[model samples]
Target: GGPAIGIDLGTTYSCVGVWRNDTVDIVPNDQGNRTTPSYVAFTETERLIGDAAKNQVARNPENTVFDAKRLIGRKFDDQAVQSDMTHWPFKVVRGPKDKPIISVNYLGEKKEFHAEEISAMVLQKMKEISEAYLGRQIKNAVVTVPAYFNDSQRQATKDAGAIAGLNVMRIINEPTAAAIAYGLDKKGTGERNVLIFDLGGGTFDVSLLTIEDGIFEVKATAGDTHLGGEDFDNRLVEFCVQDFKRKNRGMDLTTNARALRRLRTQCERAKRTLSSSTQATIELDSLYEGIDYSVAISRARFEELCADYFRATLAPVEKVLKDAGMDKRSVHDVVLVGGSTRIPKVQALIQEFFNGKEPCKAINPDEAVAYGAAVQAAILN
Candidate 1:
C-alpha cells in the first residue's frame, strides 16, 4: 500500500499502474489516458510530454526523440546496430562500450546527451505522472524489457530508472509482463504455451513461454534490437523519395534524416490503419524541404514496400520456435503484443505461416504490457 507501481517502459510508450484495493488501476497523466507516449520534449519553461511531444516531432524531430530504448547501452559504431543508429533524427554519438550518446538540440544551442539521459527524461516524466496521480511518493517499481535484452542493455535501463529516482526492483521480460496481465491464474492449474511477438516502435522481441499455476516462465526468445516498425517506416521513406525522384524532382533521401523522420511517422500511421482494413493511404509532402511533387500512397504499394521486412521478422519467430524444440505446429497459442502487430501484412503473414491457425490477438495494443506489469506488481507485493 506504500508505493508499488508496475511500469511498462516501452520504447514507444510508458505506462504506470498500481495495485488498487482489488484490481490494478492504471494511473494516467493530466491527459486521462492509461498509456503515455514515451516521447520527451525538453523546453526552457516546462517539459512537454505524450501527445504534445509527438506533435513537436513534425516541427522539431531533432528535439523530440522517441523509442530511444534501443540506443541505451548500445554503441554507435556497433555494426550489429549501426544501421539503425545512422537514421536516428537526433545525433547518436559513440559512447563507452558502443553506447549511444544522443546529441540534443535544446534551447539556443545543440548539446550532447547520451541516449540513457534521454531515456531518463522519459522515465522522469512517468514518475511525475505517477506522483501527481497517486498522491503518494512512488519509490519501488518493476520495469519491463525485452527478454532478449543483454546484460548491458538491462543494466542501462536500470541506470535510467536510477537516474529518474526509482528503485528499479527488477527488469522483467516484456513477454512475461504481458502474460501477467492476461491472468493465467484464471485457468486454475495447467500448462499453457504462449508465444509473444512484440514488434515495437524501436525493436522486435519474440518470446516462447510456459505458465503453470500462475507462475510465468520464459523458455526462449529471439529478435532484432535494430528492427521494428521503424524499419517499416524507413522503407516507406525510401519508396516515397524514390518515387519523387523518378518523377524528375531529383530528390536524394539517403542523407536527409529530417525527411526520413517525417515519412517514418506517416508509415507508422499507415501501418496501424492497415491492421483493420485491406489498405492504407499516406500523403507524401515534400521529400525534402521546399521540394515539389507531392503524392499519395495506397495500401497495395505499402505492402509491396514492406514485404521484405515482414519476411525478416519471421526469422526470429522461426529461430525461437526451433531453439525451444517446439515445431510451429506445436505452438498452442501465438500472441501479438505490440502496436506494430496491427499491420495487415504482419497478421496475414503470420496466419499463412501457421497454416491458417488463427493468430492470437485480442489484447489491446497499448495496454497489454502495462496491464501485464500491473499483474506482476500484484504478485510481487
Candidate 2:
C-alpha cells in the first residue's frame, strides 16, 4: 500500500490517520492521544516534541515554539504576523527571504530556526507515530491547510512536510476535508449547500461549499488569520494581569516568561471550565515574587472579555456568503471543526447568524478533518 496517510496539521494540535482494512482510522501517538500539541522545545542537547515540548513551555518559554504556524510561509513584514507578534511571549525575528525566525539560546549557544523548521518538527512527530503504528515506513501523505490559506502558506506547508521526510501527495483545504467526512457518512446523492465554521487555537475560517452528486465544490472562503482560542486565552490573561497590576504596581507579569506561560495555561483551563460552569476560579500561588493571584471568573464576564472575538468570526461568514452571492436560507447544513468550536458562545453565535440552524455535531470536531484527509489519500492511492 506504500503507507499513504492523511494529516490534519492543525495550528494548535495535529491529527494523523491511515487507510487500513477498507476504512480510515485515526492513529494515536505513543501517549495514546489522538491529537498531539504542535510544539517544539529545544534545550542545550535535545529537542522535545508534542506533549513533552508543550509541558516545557512554562519552564522554557523562549526556547519552546508553539505557534509557529502563525508565522510560517509569510513575509516578516506581513501586517498580520506583525500584529500577532505582540501576543507571543517568544522572540520572532525576520530571517532570509523575509521569513520569520525563532531565536533562542540552546546549551549556552545561540541558535535559530525558521518557522518552517519548527513546523517540520511537529510534522516529524506525526510521521514517527504513523510509522510505528503501521510497523512500516510511510513516505506519502495528504496534508490539510486552512481554506483561506494563500499560495505561499500552502507551499510552506508542503515544504515542512518535505523536511519531515514526507512525500506530500496533495495539499487540501481543511473545511473541504471536513465536508468530505460529512458527505461520506450521509452518502447524500443530491445537491446541498453547506457552511464549515472552523475555529482553532490560532486561526478561524468560514467556508461555503456546494456538494452535488459526490462532488464538493468550494464557493467562497473567508477568515481572520490571527483569531481563535489563543486570542480568548490572551484576553483572559490580560484581565488577570491587570488585576495583578491593580494590586501590585510597577511589576509587569508579561515581562516574566514563566509567569506569563503559567497564567496563560491557567487562563486557558478557566476558559474551558467556564464553557460548562457559570464560574471558574483561577488561583496561582507565588506567581511572581511571593505574589499570589486568584480570581473567580463568571462565564458572563469571560464572554464579555472575549465578546469581540466571538463577533469577529461572523464577519467572515457574511463575507463568504456575500462573495458567493448566497442567501443564508440556501445553506442546508453547517459543520463545525477544530477544538475551539466547542465553546458555547461560538456555537450560539453561529446559530443566531444562520437563523438558529445548529451545525452538525455527529462527527468529532477535532478528528473530522483528518478523517476526511484519509479518505482523500485513499482516493489518490
Candidate 3:
C-alpha cells in the first residue's frame, strides 16, 4: 500500500511528512519547499496558494487571505474575529451557520470562502506534492492541530481534511505530536516529565506531558490563542513606524497598508537576525509614501520592545506546570516546539525558567510537529 503521510496544518506555515521503509520522510513541494506558507490568493484569472499566494498578498490585499486559522470554525461575532476585522485588509462576514466567512471581489465577481476552505486549499497543495513525489495516489493522513483548540476548532480542521479529500485518521494535538517526534529515538524510558512550549506565528501553546513505557499522556495545557511571533513583529512594526514618524515630523506610516507591509517584512527579517546576532539593520527603499529609510536595531532594544509578549508565553508554561502539580526540576525534557523558540531570548528564558536544562533538540523546531504526526500515521497504518 502507498504510505500515509502526516500533516502539521499550522497557522503560519504547513508541512507534510510520510513514514516510509522504517524511516520518516519530510515531503517538499514542487518548489522544493519543505514547508508552505498558509496563504491563498484569488487573482483575476486564477487562484494561487502557498508561497505564491503570500508573495502577492500585498498586491491583492482584499483578495488574499492569510491567518485564516484565527477564524476557522469561529462565529462571525467572535471576539477574536471582531478584533481581526480592524486590521485585516480582507472583508469578513457571517455565513449561514454564523461561521466566519471571507468575502472578496475576484475577477469582477464577488466570492466567499469559509476559513476551512482556505485551509483546505493549502492541504490540497500538500496532497498534490506528496502524490507527485511518491508516484502514488495519497489518501490517509494524521493531522496535528493546536493543543488548546476547542471542539469546534478541531471539527473545522477535520472538515478541512475532508475538503482536501483525505482520510484524517486522527487529529493529534501539536504538543503531543512534538513529544512523539522527540521520543521516537529514546529507549527504555521511565516516566519522563516533558514540557512542550509552542509559540508559532498565530498562537501560543504550552503542554505538560508524562511519558512512560510507550504511553503518552497530557497532564495539562494552556496558551493565548492570539499570541505568537506575529505579535512580536507587530511590536517591532510599532517601534519602527513610531521612529519613522518622529524622524519625518509627523509623517505617519501606520495608515498605509503597503508601507506597513514592507516595514513588517523588514521587521520580521530583523527579528530573525536578532535571534543570532546582537544587532540587525532594517533598510527599505521608498518604504512609505516615497520615503527611503534605514535603521539599526540592537537585539537588546528589540527584546525591550517585545519583551512583555515573550514573558507572557512563560505564564502559560508556568500555568501548565502548576496544573500538572510539577515544578521546573520535575520536567525531564523541555522540548521547544515552534519557530519562535529559535529566538535566543526565548531559548534563554525557557532555559532559565526550567532551571538550566536545555530544551530537547531531538527534532527540528519547525518540522517537529509534522514529523510527530508522521509517526502517528505510521502507528495507525
Score every model by TM-score: 0.81, 0.87, 0.92
Q: Rank the candidates by TM-score, best first.
A: 3, 2, 1
Clashing pairs in 2: 44-107
Q: Provide the overall lDDT of each model, using Cα atoms, as 2-decimal numbers.
A: 0.76, 0.87, 0.87
Model 3 agreement with the true structure over 1-381: per-residue lDDT tens digits: 778899999989999999877767899887898889999999889899998898777788888888888888789988878998897888998889787889988777899999999999998999999999999999899999876689999999999999999899999988889988876325465787788888888788888888788777889999987788888888889989989988898899978877888899888899889887999999999988788988999999988998788768789988998898987888888888777788888998899887788788657788999989999998898
Scored by lDDT, model 2 comes in at: 0.87
Per-residue lDDT over 177-268 for candidate 2, one digit per residue giving the tens place of the 0 to 100 score: 88878764355667789899888887888899888886778899889777878889999999999989987986789888788988999998
RMSD of each: 3.8, 2.9, 2.3
Cα deviation of 139 in candidate 1 (Å)?
3.1
Least well predicted 10-residue stretch by lDDT in candidate 3: 182-191
Candidate 3 is scored at a TM of: 0.92
How high is the lDDT of residue 157 in model 1?
A: 90
What is the RMSD, in Å, between candidate 3 and the native fold over all Cα?
2.3
Candidate 3 stretches with Cα past 4 Å from truth are 21-23, 184-189, 247-249
